[PDB]
């Protein structure tokens, strides 16, 4: 484990070069920048068309090398 | 929300009283003053109650008087203060009719 | 918030001041003063370091002697400097300054 | 079922209570003649003292 | 007539706790709830107590003998946590190894 | 720091220190850097320094502990009663610090909260001293309460700890229940707290009467509650389990530190505030109890721990008698045997601690100790004598003192049953002197020898102890200092 | 310099509620005593 | 009437308190017991102190006896024993102590007998009518902070304990980290 | 107080709601709980202090909120300590 | 007389509002996942929760015989006590509340500390050891992000002078709170999600996966009690959201066009939002281990809920800024 | 008993209080407070007011009888 | 500044609330004394409301009931 614990620090090390680095990293966390990146995606779809078939009035879509019913 | 008794009396209530409260305290802040002091020597109610008597003629005065002067908007400042249980803020429009009437 | 500064016992020297600020109190800090806050700490920094060395930490042993008896050494000089300052001590030094 | 004894306890304790305040209002009516119980009592003692004396 | 009242059950609350302490032999933790209880009704006078005498001394004292009583439910529950882990049972002839 | 609070400066430096203490220990016993270090010794010794420093604060400080008589009349009043009654305190709680320190590293209990739990107490200690309120009182008798029931309990894995924490859990919770309810009455029916409007209210009026039932009860109550923290007969059956079962260190820190601070405050509310003949009744009872069961129940032991424990049963029984008299020689004559008995038990336990090396666990096992240890079976005893209350140690300075306080007294039938138990209960002590000097056993338990630290404080309590009857004047006029300005 | 770095970038929760809460208690210790003053 | 409703529903759940046979019973009795002398609070007029009894009493301390009580599955015969031998002691000792409630109230507090018109209303307190809550505060925090701290210490002191007592971390299990190279950067890698 | 009534009769409605809807079928070990445990209580004692304060800080001047602030910080030293020795983990 | 029928017109209302909600946290969750939902029992589905709650009226109970049989039937009635009792506080406009208690807050605290008992029940009076776990686990996690939640209810009081919720709003009327606090809104919207084991911390939900939960042994309607006492929990700390940082009944900009809305309407809208929100989180988002979630409420949301009651008792006690 | 009432406001008889530990700050005797430590008892707990209250009320329901 | 403008309004009209309660409790006890001095006239060496309390300090009457204000 010592040698996972001299790579955690040498990683930390590695991305905090500089305190604008870190100041952009520590904001990313806290104000949940991807978290709000997924729910504008999720947005989009919610306002998007969707695909539902329709069932019993619209039928999906066969091809005449269907194997269905001998 | 009356306000006013069958002969033209004017109810003490508490919706007449703290719409005339402004004019209570100008007109007589002194005996007002003076029953209090004398409360504050003495807590009995037989002690002193000619003070408390002044002072209630003086409020039953003002009362009538403001009556007979707007009748009104009086009463209309009267009906909002109680429809609102004397929120001051709910009723806006008819405190500033009544004071226009009787100026402080 | 009310605050009272009487003492149940009446100083027995001549008192410079009844509340004296802590500003004042630390500026009348004389040499004795300054010898309590050196031995204390001294004290304390000697005892972390020796008491640390088993465990193996006598960097951080003799720095936490050290904040240990930076506090208390402050606290005593402070003390005796009020005490002082107060008339509860024999301040013939900041009373012959008084006057 | 438990619910039955639990109500039936309760009307008891209920009852107990009721009883409890029969009790303070007994307290309440009968506190004159301890008082003088009590005042007869502390005379008596008084004229003792006053006839060691 | 309503403090006669208020008396009178913060007291039977206090003996019912009593009884709980007596009449659970071989339950321990039933009599640290009698304990609780006994707690409750001090609390129950104290309050009773202010409101009727107009001091805020009761309310106060209760407030503290409230946060006093949780810290010793913690740490009495960690006692029969670890009571209970070293010797598996909570059984009270296991309790008496010291006579 | 503003100038109200020169009257706080050891507690607050106490209370300090002991954060320190706590977070460097926990940031340095949970560190992967070094090997997880047992921190126990490194933080008893800087809590031993900051008991030292804050002694040194409250001796030096002596009027500047009266700064804001009146903000600070609400919670608590510092007096040279109270300023002696701390100095004691903290003399004891430095000399329980320095003994214990061998136990740790040679019995692996290194915990370092165990020290943190000592500081923290020992401020409960002194707030307890220092307080004047029926709400200070309370809230430092279960601070004190609660880091006892962890001291108890401190050894998790072993049997004995973990069934002598329950069992002073459960009977200190009750206590503490009984006590509340003590106040909770004297409140209603008084409408105080405050010693002094206690003092007020209850002055010139007894409190046996149809008047003040409800404070006669709380007053008893409050008193049953005090009487279980000094361990008296009719509440008295936590001491001996607790004190066994508790690690060596935890019970000779609860025989020792609580009894001052407690007394102390028994005092401040009983002798000054409700000082009436009932509370010296209940107290002379308790007392007789206290004494005769001690003796009898000390002489049917067979284990050191169990034998301390009801020893210091009977010594609580006569600081009883003392207290109980209640005058001005009978107060100073409570201070002198708790300085004596604090001294003698602070001995015991040193020399206990030193035999615990070995694990000594019966009074057989110290058997040919004057052959193996020769001084140290003349230091045991010695102290075993001074128990007894043999002229020339410390302990019969306190004993005849306390029987002149109670020939004075008027209580010829306390003094009588006080004699007969130091008669009766000095068997044991002899017993103890027999297995160390007389027998000659078939197999000898050979005991390693003692830390400096243990050393030091052994020598200089014995010195204090045989060589007391030499010059006893500075304590008697200590205590008689005491219990003059227990009042004016 | 560079661990105090290094702890932000482990630990930024911890870091962000300590430096809020050195800001609340640096308002009254400091800026209440300035206002009091130029008041 | 509501008082008298209140206190015998407490009074019958701390007797079944006293007298479950289950443990968690228990518990839930103990709750139902605060919860009557919240209702008596609440008739007091002291509503702070019955909200915090609910969170505090109710909240805190009686879920942790049911974790702990369920936690333990104690079994019957294992705490069990009979109740008609302690029935004459406890009777005793709850007659001596009702006797002395007698003899309190007897002397002391006296009870009115049967007042409505005769209350005088100050009406000089009421302008600014002053909370339970906010008297409280106020005192607790302006006047009395000595007996306000240390409860501080005392819940230090208990949290202090439960750790040293009740902490058992485990000696060889693997802890995830998030702090992982493939977490913080990534670079993409290939076969090539 | 003179509103809690409608508390308490609303609390009846929806007992008789409940049994209402139960009734209409008819007609046809390990101590971090432990540790939780006790962190609830000491933060419900936190919270029970705070709500006074925070009603009463208008009144309470410096000296109120520094006492709180102290209190705070006494408490706080206790949240380190669990943090460090592996309370809050599981 | 008409405290009942108040009570009545509270408690039925919010029953429609429940079932209304899980019919639109389904819709919304298809419309999220490019899929429609309920349409085929009624016009747009509207008739789906009627349908819903008549099948499982009309499904035949069985007895689990568990030997805690009254324990086991009233915890999830426990529970809907609680959520009505909790609901039956928060106002709605100026002059709609029931009991304008003082304490409001404080009651809501205390409402939301007694419901983890139905919880902890229904978990010890099933016979699997499964649902005792799980019990205890959501009963744990529940204390946890109460904790979190009565340190942002601090925060607000601090901002507020005041304790009920009438006069909160009225404080609100200058800048609704949400503008100051909105981080302090965040942290209580994440604070009760994980109240209520709603979208991430979802432990009883995760059937599907090996936490299992509290209601596997319950039948229909111990399981439809539990259902509806979640949802009324999830529209009441919408509500309390609402009325703490968003102003409850108050327009925005005061203008006189806004004015004309009666209020209660922007309550309702505002509530809305917030729903809608608790269903785009649970549906953007994966969920949390127990461990983690525990571990973050623990150490995440206590103390910067602490750093953030210090910094607002600090802008306000040194600014004249108090009321 | 501290002034501090239950409603923020002056205590019922911290007057009575405060009159009867004037009264021991300044005497020669302790018995010379006796009227005015009964005072302060008296509106503690109301006993001879309510003696006094019990007993017309007794007189009242005899002369019924 | 809105609840300063509250509590003013009802600080002037305290004095003549404060005496109408008073003339009202004036009567009442007078009606009260009279029916105490009609009930126990029979009884030798009674009082006509004689004060249980010294040095004079006129205090309202004992209700019985804690708190009977807030309900
Ligand atoms: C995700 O999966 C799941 C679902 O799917 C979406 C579900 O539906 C459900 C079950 C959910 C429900 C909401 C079923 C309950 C159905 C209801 C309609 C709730 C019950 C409401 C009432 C009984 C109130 C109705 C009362 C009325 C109409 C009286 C009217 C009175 C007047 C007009 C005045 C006097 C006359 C569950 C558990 C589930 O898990
Ligand atoms: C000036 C007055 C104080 C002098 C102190 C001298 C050193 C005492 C501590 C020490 O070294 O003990 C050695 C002993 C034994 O150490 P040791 O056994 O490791 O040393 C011998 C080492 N070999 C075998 C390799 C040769 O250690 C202890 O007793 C434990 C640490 C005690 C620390 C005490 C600190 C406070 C001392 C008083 C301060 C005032
Ligand atoms: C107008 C008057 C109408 C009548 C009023 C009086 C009605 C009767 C009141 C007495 C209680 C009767 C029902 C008892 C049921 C006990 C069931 C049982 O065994 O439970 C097991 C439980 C133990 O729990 P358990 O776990 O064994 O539960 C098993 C329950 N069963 C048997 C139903 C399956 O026992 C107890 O809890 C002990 C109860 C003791 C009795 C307490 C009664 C209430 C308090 C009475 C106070 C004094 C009243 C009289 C005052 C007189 C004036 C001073
Ligand atoms: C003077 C004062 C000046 C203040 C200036 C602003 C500072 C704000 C700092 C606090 C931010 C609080 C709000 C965010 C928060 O609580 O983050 C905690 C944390 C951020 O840290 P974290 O917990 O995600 O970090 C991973 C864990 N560690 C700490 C070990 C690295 O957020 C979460 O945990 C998010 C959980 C899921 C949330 C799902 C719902 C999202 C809803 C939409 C949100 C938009």
Redesign the pocket.
């Known amino acids: 484990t010592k040698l996972e614990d001299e790579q955690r620090e040498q990683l930390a090390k590695e991305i905090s070069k500089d305190w604008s680095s870190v100041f952009e990293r520590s904001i990313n966390t806290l104000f949940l920048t991807e978290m709000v990146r997924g729910l504008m995606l999720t947005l989009k779809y919610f306002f998007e068309t969707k695909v539902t078939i329709n069932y019993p009035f619209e039928k999906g879509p066969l091809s005449p090398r269907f194997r269905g019913e001998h | 929300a009356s306000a006013v008794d069958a002969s033209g009396n004017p109810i003490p209530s508490s919706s007449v009283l703290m719409a005339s409260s402004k004019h209570i305290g100008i007109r007589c802040h002194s005996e007002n003053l003076d029953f209090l002091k004398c409360k504050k020597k003495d807590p009995n109610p037989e002690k002193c109650l000619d003070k408390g008597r002044d002072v209630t003629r003086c409020v039953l005065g003002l009362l009538k008087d403001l009556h007979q002067k707007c009748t009104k908007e009086m009463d209309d400042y009267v009906g909002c203060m109680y429809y609102h249980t004397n929120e001051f803020d709910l009723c806006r429009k008819e405190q500033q009719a009544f004071e226009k009437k009787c100026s402080l | 918030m009310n605050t009272d500064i009487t003492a149940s016992t009446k100083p027995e020297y001549p008192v410079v001041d009844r509340n004296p600020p802590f500003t004042k109190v630390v500026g009348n800090f004389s040499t004795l003063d300054y010898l309590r806050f050196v031995t204390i700490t001294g004290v304390s920094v000697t005892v972390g370091y020796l008491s640390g060395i088993k465990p193996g930490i006598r960097g951080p042993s003799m720095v936490t002697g050290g904040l240990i008896g930076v506090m208390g050494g402050f606290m005593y000089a402070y003390q005796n400097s009020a005490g002082r300052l107060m008339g509860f001590f024999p301040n013939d030094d900041e009373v012959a300054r008084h006057n | 079922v438990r619910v039955a004894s639990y109500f039936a306890m309760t009307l008891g304790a209920f009852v107990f209570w009721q009883s409890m305040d029969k009790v303070h209002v007994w307290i309440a009516l009968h506190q004159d003649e301890k008082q003088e119980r009590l005042e007869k009592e502390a005379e008596i003692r008084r004229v003792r003292e006053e006839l060691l004396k | 007539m309503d403090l006669i009242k208020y008396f009178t059950f913060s007291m039977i609350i206090f003996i019912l706790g009593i009884w709980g302490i007596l009449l659970n032999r071989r339950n321990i933790l039933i009599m640290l709830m009698s304990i609780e209880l006994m707690l409750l009704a001090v609390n129950s006078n104290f309050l009773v107590f202010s409101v009727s005498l107009d001091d805020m001394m009761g309310q106060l004292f209760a407030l503290l003998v409230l946060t006093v009583a949780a810290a010793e439910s913690a740490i009495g529950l960690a006692i029969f946590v670890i009571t209970f882990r070293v010797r598996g049972t909570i059984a009270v002839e296991f309790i008496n190894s010291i006579q | 720091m503003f100038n109200l609070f020169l009257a706080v400066y050891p507690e607050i430096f106490i209370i300090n220190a002991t954060f320190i203490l706590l977070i460097h220990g926990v940031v340095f016993s949970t560190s992967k850097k070094y090997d997880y270090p047992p921190l126990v010794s490194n933080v008893g010794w800087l809590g031993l320094l900051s008991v030292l420093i804050t002694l040194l604060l409250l001796a030096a400080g002596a009027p500047l502990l009266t700064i804001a008589h009146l903000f600070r009349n609400n919670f608590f009043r510092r007096d040279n009663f109270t300023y002696f009654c701390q100095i004691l305190l903290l003399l004891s709680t430095a000399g329980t610090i320095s003994m214990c320190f061998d136990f740790f590293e040679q019995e692996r209990f290194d915990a370092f909260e165990f020290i943190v739990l000592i500081l923290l107490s020992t401020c409960s200690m002194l707030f307890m001293i220092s307080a004047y309120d029926l709400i200070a009182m309370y809230l430092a008798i279960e601070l004190q309460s609660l880091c006892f029931y962890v001291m108890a309990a401190s050894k998790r894995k072993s049997e004995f700890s973990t069934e002598a924490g329950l069992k002073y859990l459960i009977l200190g919770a009750f206590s503490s229940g009984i006590l509340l309810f003590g106040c909770s009455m004297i409140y209603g029916s008084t409408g105080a707290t405050h010693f002094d409007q206690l003092a007020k209210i209850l002055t010139g009026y007894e409190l046996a009467g149809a008047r003040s039932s409800g404070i006669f009860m709380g007053i008893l109550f409050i008193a049953v509650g005090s009487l279980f923290k000094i361990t008296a007969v009719p509440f008295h059956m936590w001491a001996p389990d607790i004190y066994e079962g508790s690690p060596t260190p935890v019970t000779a820190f609860l025989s020792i530190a609580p009894k001052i601070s407690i007394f102390a405050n028994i005092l401040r509310v009983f002798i000054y505030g409700s000082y009436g003949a009932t509370l010296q009744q209940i107290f002379c009872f308790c007392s007789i109890a206290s004494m005769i069961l001690g003796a009898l129940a000390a002489m049917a032991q067979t284990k050191v721990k169990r034998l301390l424990a009801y020893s210091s049963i009977g010594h609580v029984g006569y600081i009883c008698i003392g207290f109980s008299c209640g005058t001005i020689e009978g107060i100073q004559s409570l201070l002198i045997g708790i300085f004596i008995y604090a001294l003698m038990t602070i001995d015991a336990f040193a020399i206990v601690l030193a035999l615990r090396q070995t694990r000594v666990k019966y009074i057989a096992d110290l058997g040919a100790l004057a052959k193996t240890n020769p001084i140290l079976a003349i230091t045991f005893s010695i102290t075993m004598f001074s128990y007894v209350g043999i002229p020339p140690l410390a302990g019969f300075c306190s004993k005849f003192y306390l029987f002149f306080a109670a020939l004075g007294c008027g209580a010829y039938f306390l003094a009588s049953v006080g004699v007969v138990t130091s008669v009766i209960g000095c068997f044991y002590y002899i017993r103890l002197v027999k297995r160390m000097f007389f027998d000659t056993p078939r197999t000898w338990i050979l005991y390693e020898p003692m830390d400096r630290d243990k050393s030091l404080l052994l020598a200089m309590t014995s010195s204090f102890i045989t060589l007391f009857f030499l010059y006893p004047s500075p304590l008697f006029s200590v205590t008689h200092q005491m219990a003059l300005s227990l009042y004016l | 310099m560079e661990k105090l770095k290094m702890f932000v970038v482990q630990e930024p929760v911890v870091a962000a509620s300590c430096l809020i809460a050195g800001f609340g208690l640096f308002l009254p210790a400091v800026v209440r005593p300035i206002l009091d003053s130029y008041q | 009437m509501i008082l008298s409703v209140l206190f015998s529903l407490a009074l019958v759940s701390g007797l079944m308190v006293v007298r479950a046979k289950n443990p968690v019973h228990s518990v839930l009795f103990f709750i139902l017991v605060f919860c009557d002398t919240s209702g008596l609070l609440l008739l007091l007029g002291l509503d702070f102190f019955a909200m915090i009894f609910l969170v505090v009493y109710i909240g805190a301390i009686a879920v942790l006896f049911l974790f702990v009580v369920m936690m333990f599955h104690i079994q019957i015969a294992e705490i069990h024993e009979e109740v008609l031998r302690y029935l004459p002691v406890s009777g005793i000792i709850g007659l001596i102590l009702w006797w002395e409630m007698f003899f309190i109230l007897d002397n002391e507090t006296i009870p009115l007998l049967p007042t409505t018109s005769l209350i005088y209303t100050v009406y000089a307190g009421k302008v600014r009518s002053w909370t339970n809550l906010e008297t409280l505060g106020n005192l607790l925090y302006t006047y009395y902070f000595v007996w306000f701290l240390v409860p501080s210490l005392i819940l230090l002191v208990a949290m202090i304990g439960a750790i040293v007592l009740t902490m058992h971390r485990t000696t060889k299990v693997k802890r995830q980290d998030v702090f992982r190279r493939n977490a913080i950067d990534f670079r993409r890698t290939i076969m090539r | 107080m003179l509103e809690f009534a409608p508390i308490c009769i609303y609390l009846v409605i929806s007992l008789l709601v409940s049994l209402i ?1 139960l009734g209409l079928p008819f007609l046809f070990f390990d101590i971090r709980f432990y540790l939780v445990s006790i962190l609830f209580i000491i933060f419900d004692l936190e919270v029970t202090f705070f709500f006074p304060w925070a009603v009463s800080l208008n009144k309470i001047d410096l000296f109120g909120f520094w006492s709180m602030m102290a209190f705070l910080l006494i408490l706080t030293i206790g949240f380190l300590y669990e943090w460090k020795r592996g309370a809050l983990d599981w | 007389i008409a405290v009942p029928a108040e009570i ?1 017109g509270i408690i ?1 209302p919010l ?2 509002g ?2 209304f909600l ?2 639109a946290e ?1 819709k919304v969750m298809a419309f999220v996942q490019r899929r429609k939902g309920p349409d085929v029992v009624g016009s747009f589905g509207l008739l ?3 349908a ?2 008549l099948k ?1 009226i009309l499904k035949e109970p069985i007895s689990p015989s568990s030997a805690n049989f009254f324990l086991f039937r009233m915890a999830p009635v426990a529970t809907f006590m609680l959520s009505l009792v909790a609901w039956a506080v928060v106002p709605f406009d100026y002059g709609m509340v029931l009991s304008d208690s003082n304490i409001g807050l404080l009651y809501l605290f205390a409402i939301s500390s007694l419901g983890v008992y139905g919880i902890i029940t229904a978990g010890w009076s099933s016979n699997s050891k499964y649902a005792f776990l799980g019990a205890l686990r959501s009963a744990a996690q529940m204390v946890s992000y109460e904790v979190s939640i009565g340190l942002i209810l601090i925060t607000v009081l601090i901002c507020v002078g005041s304790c009920n919720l009438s006069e909160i709003v009225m404080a609100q009327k200058q800048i609704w709170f949400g503008i100051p606090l909105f981080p302090v809104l965040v942290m209580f919207f994440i604070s009760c999600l994980a109240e209520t084991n709603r979208a991430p911390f979802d432990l009883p939900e995760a059937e599907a996966e090996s936490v299992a939960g509290y209601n596997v042994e319950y039948s229909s309607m111990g ?2 009690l539990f ?2 006492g979640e949802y009324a929990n999830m529209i009441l700390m919408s509500g309390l959201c609402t009325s703490l940082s968003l102003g409850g009944w108050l327009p925005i900009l005061d203008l006189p066009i806004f004015k004309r809305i009666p209020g209660s309407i922007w309550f309702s809208i505002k509530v809305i939002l917030f729903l809608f929100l608790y269903i785009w989180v649970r549906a953007a988002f994966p969920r949390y281990r127990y461990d983690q979630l525990m571990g973050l409420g623990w150490k995440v949301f206590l103390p910067l809920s602490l750093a953030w009651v210090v910094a607002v008792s600090g802008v306000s006690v040194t600014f004249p800024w108090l009321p | 008993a501290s002034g501090w009432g239950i409603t923020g406001n002056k205590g019922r008889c911290y007057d009575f209080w405060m009159d009867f530990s004037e009264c021991m700050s300044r005497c020669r005797e302790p018995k010379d407070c006796g009227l005015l430590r009964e005072d302060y008892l008296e509106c503690l707990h109301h006993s001879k007011e309510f003696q006094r209250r019990n007993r017309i009320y007794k007189e009242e329901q005899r002369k019924i009888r | 500044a809105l609840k300063e403008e509250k509590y003013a309004a009802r600080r002037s009209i305290l004095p003549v609330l404060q005496a109408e309660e008073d003339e009202r409790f004036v009567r009442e006890w007078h009606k009260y004394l009279a029916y105490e001095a009609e009930v126990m006239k029979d009884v030798p060496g009674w009082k006509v409301g004689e004060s249980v309390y010294n040095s004079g300090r006129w205090v309202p009457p004992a209700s019985g009931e804690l708190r009977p204000d807030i309900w």
Do not use: K, N, T, W
């Open positions: 809807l | 009545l039925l029953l429609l429940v079932a899980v019919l389904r789906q929760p009627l819903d709650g499982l399981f439809a259902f509806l």
